[PDB]
Amino acid sequence: PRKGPAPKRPLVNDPVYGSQLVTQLVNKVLLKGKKSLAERIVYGALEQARDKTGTDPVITLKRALDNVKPALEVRSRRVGGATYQVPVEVRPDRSTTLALRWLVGYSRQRREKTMIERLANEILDASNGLGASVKRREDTHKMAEANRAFAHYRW
Amino acid sequence: IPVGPRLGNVVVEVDHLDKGYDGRALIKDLSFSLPRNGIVGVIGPNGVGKTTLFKTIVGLET
Amino acid sequence: MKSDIHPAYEETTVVCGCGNTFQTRSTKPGGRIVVEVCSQCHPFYTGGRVARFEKRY
Amino acid sequence: PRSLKKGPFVDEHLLKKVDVQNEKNTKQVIKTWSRRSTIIPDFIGHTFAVHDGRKHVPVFVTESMVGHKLGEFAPTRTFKGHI
Amino acid sequence: ARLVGVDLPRDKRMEVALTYIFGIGRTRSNEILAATGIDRDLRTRDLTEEQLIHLRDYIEANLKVEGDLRREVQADIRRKIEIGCYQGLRHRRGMPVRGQRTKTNARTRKGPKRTI
RNA sequence: CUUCACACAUGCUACAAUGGCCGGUACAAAGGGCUGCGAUGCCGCGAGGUUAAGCGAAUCCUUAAAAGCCGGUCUCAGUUCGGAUCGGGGUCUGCAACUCGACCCCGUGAAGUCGGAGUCGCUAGUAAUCGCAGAUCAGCAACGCUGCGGUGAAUACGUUCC
Ligand SMILES: Nc1ncnc2c1ncn2[C@@H]1O[C@H](COP(=O)(O)OP(=O)(O)O)[C@@H](O)[C@H]1O
Numbered sequence: 098p099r100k101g102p103a104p105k106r107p108l109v110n111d112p113v114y115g116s117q118l119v120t121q122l123v124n125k126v127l128l129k130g131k132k133s134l135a136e137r138i139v140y141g142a143l144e145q146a147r148d149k150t151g152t153d154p155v156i157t158l159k160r161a162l163d164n165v166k167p168a169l170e171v172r173s174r175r176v177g178g179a180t181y182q183v184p185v186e187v188r189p190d191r192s193t194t195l196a197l198r199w200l201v202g203y204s205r206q207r208r209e210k211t212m213i214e215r216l217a218n219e220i221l222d223a224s225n226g227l228g229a230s231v232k233r234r235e236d237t238h239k240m241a242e243a244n245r246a247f248a249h250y251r252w
Numbered sequence: 253i254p255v256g257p258r259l260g261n262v263v264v265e266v267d268h269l270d271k272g273y274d275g276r277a278l279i280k281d282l283s284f285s286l287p288r289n290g291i292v293g294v295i296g297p298n299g300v301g302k303t304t305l306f307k308t309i310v311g312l313e314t
Numbered sequence: 315m316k317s318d319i320h321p322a323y324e325e326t327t328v329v330c331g332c333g334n335t336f337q338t339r340s341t342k343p344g345g346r347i348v349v350e351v352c353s354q355c356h357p358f359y360t361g362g363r364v365a366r367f368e369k370r371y
Numbered sequence: 372p373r374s375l376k377k378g379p380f381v382d383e384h385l386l387k388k389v390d391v392q393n394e395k396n397t398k399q400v401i402k403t404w405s406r407r408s409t410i411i412p413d414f415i416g417h418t419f420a421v422h423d424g425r426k427h428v429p430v431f432v433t434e435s436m437v438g439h440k441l442g443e444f445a446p447t448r449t450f451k452g453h454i
Numbered sequence: 455a456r457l458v459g460v461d462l463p464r465d466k467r468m469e470v471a472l473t474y475i476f477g478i479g480r481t482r483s484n485e486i487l488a489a490t491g492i493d494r495d496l497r498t499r500d501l502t503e504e505q506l507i508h509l510r511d512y513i514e515a516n517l518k519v520e521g522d523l524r525r526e527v528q529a530d531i532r533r534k535i536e537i538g539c540y541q542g543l544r545h546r547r548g549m550p551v552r553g554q555r556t557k558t559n560a561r562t563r564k565g566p567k568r569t570i
Numbered sequence: 571c572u573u574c575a576c577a578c579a580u581g582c583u584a585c586a587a588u589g590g591c592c593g594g595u596a597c598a599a600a601g602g603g604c605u606g607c608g609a610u611g612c613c614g615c616g617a618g619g620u621u622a623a624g625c626g627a628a629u630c631c632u633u634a635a636a637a638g639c640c641g642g643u644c645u646c647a648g649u650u651c652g653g654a655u656c657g658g659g660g661u662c663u664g665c666a667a668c669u670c671g672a673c674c675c676c677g678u679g680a681a682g683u684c685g686g687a688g689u690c691g692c693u694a695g696u697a698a699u700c701g702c703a704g705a706u707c708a709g710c711a712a713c714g715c716u717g718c719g720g721u722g723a724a725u726a727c728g729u730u731c732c
Pocket residue numbers: 273276278296297298299300301302303304
């Protein structure tokens with residue numbers, strides 16, 4: 098932090114679907130170190146993402162991510178007696194991270210029975226611009242467009 | 253509006269419903285789960301079957 | 315008023331699991347009232363504390 | 372005596388006090404300090420005076436105290452209320 | 455169905471349905487459903503009528519179920535209160551009878567907080 | 571020293587489906603053992619009981635690791651979640667378990683549906699979770715403390731603010 102920028106860990110491709118996004122997706126479903134249960138859910142939510150679309154599930158996921166990747170998020174700061182949020186431009190590698198927890202994070206609190214389809218019913222709707230994960234990327238934008246006046250506080 | 257008892261994780265759920273009348277079939281292939289702590293709006297032009305959808309839910313029309 | 319406001323009431327043969335049956339009149343539709351216990355599968359015909367240590371306690 | 376193998380343990384110095392009086396139909400009072408002892412039905416007929424720390428609280432083993440210890444009849448902590 | 459005045463529910467297996475009797479848990483239920491042949495997958499909406507009759511005399515010849523089993527419990531409390539044992543001077547006051555810590559915890563025999 | 575009209579503090583188990591209960595089946599490490607450890611066989615639903623093989627131990631015993639993996643089942647309910655309280659019957663150590671022990675079995679089936687203002691820990695084999703062993707010790711309030719491994723994350727723009 099305060100000295101320099103910290104080094105970054107690499108990633109290994111998933112054997113079932115060769116893609117960096119897939120192991121990065123299994124890694125954030127993971128609670129409690131139970132890793133193979135987290136790959137028994139992401140595989141079961143991509144394989145069920147072709148039973149009712151028929152297309153390739155990686156291509157479904159590269160576009161449901163592209164409907165939840167933000168590019169302009171907002172970031173609080175205090176000046177005097179009023180504290181007011183300043184919009185900042187988002188670097189690309191942070192964008193894929195906020196997008197991907199917006200998939201898993203809303204999928205826990207849907208209304209189905211098991212996590213195998215709750216992640217599937219959110220990858221489905223975000224590929225068409227429907228779900229609650231897509232609701233936030235515009236509220237992240239609309240909160241940060243309704244404050245464009247404070248755009249000269251880049252710290 | 254008075255406050256009622258505690259609402260569970262299910263409210264009401266409708267899966268692949270079909271209902272109309274004789275030749276005039278007004279509901280085909282509808283599936284939804286009705287949410288918890290929200291306000292649900294039914295939008296549709298007249299003569300489409302918005303009142304009859306609540307006949308099935310209340311249970312006066314199978 | 316002893317006309318067509320009272321419920322339907324015709325004779326009704328009733329059986330139990332004990333096998334003792336009888337024939338009375340009641341409002342069950344079909345003569346089909348079925349019990350699992352009766353008044354002749356039972357008597358009305360003929361019928362800690364100091365017992366603690368007797369298992370050498 | 373908690374286990375049924377070794378039988379119901381009751382201290383010896385009170386067993387001799389009840390056997391000397393039960394044979395000739397004599398029901399005195401007995402001063403004792405053996406809270407650990409269990410009720411045998413051998414001394415249904417007469418009373419006791421069990422210790423608590425102040426003074427020997429009297430107890431009359433009537434018919435259904437048996438099985439329980441003597442010391443369940445002396446509460447040893449007073450507590451008659453915070454107010 | 456109706457085993458002994460107890461109103462067995464519907465659409466629930468017999469492995470769990472007999473547990474609703476006051477006196478049958480998960481272990482005595484497994485030996486009611488072995489001595490009378492009834493398997494551990496039989497739903498309650500398709501019970502045979504005489505198959506319940508086998509089910510209601512193995513219980514009423516060996517076990518003790520309610521009506522008098524509630525009378526077993528509260529009369530055994532009723533004896534301890536009147537003999538004057540300390541454990542019956544403990545049911546008089548709503549305090550734990552098994553030497554539990556009464557300083558910080560023990561809300562269950564007492565009730566929730568009142569902050570006087 | 572353990573008492574309770576109540577307040578604080580450190581923990582543990584939880585409120586479930588990334589789960590509960592059943593049947594299969596794998597991969598550890600570091601440790602203790604002659605006042606002992608108890609293989610194996612027989613009996614007991616179970617804690618245990620009883621015989622006695624081997625061993626001052628890289629021998630032999632402690633030992634069978636638990637999560638995990640493959641199948642079934644419950645289908646979102648204060649429940650097949652939860653295991654508190656209380657009845658009943660036992661086992662073990664010990665002169666003795668009543669105030670005041672741990673474990674087992676049977677029935678019961680409490681409060682709780684992710685917690686107000688505030689606040690805490692963690693930058694990598696780390697947090698999170700999963701058991702195993704030791705020191706005290708006759709037995710234990712062993713969920714505590716000291717240790718060991720199994721599985722194994724996310725993020726760090728930056729020094730404006732505390
Ligand atoms: N009792 C009935 N029998 C047959 N058809 C009916 C009956 N009541 C309503 N409908 C049909 O229902 C359709 C619309 O339902 P309706 O309740 O009128 O919807 P909305 O309330 O949205 O106007 C109409 O086509 C009408 O013909």
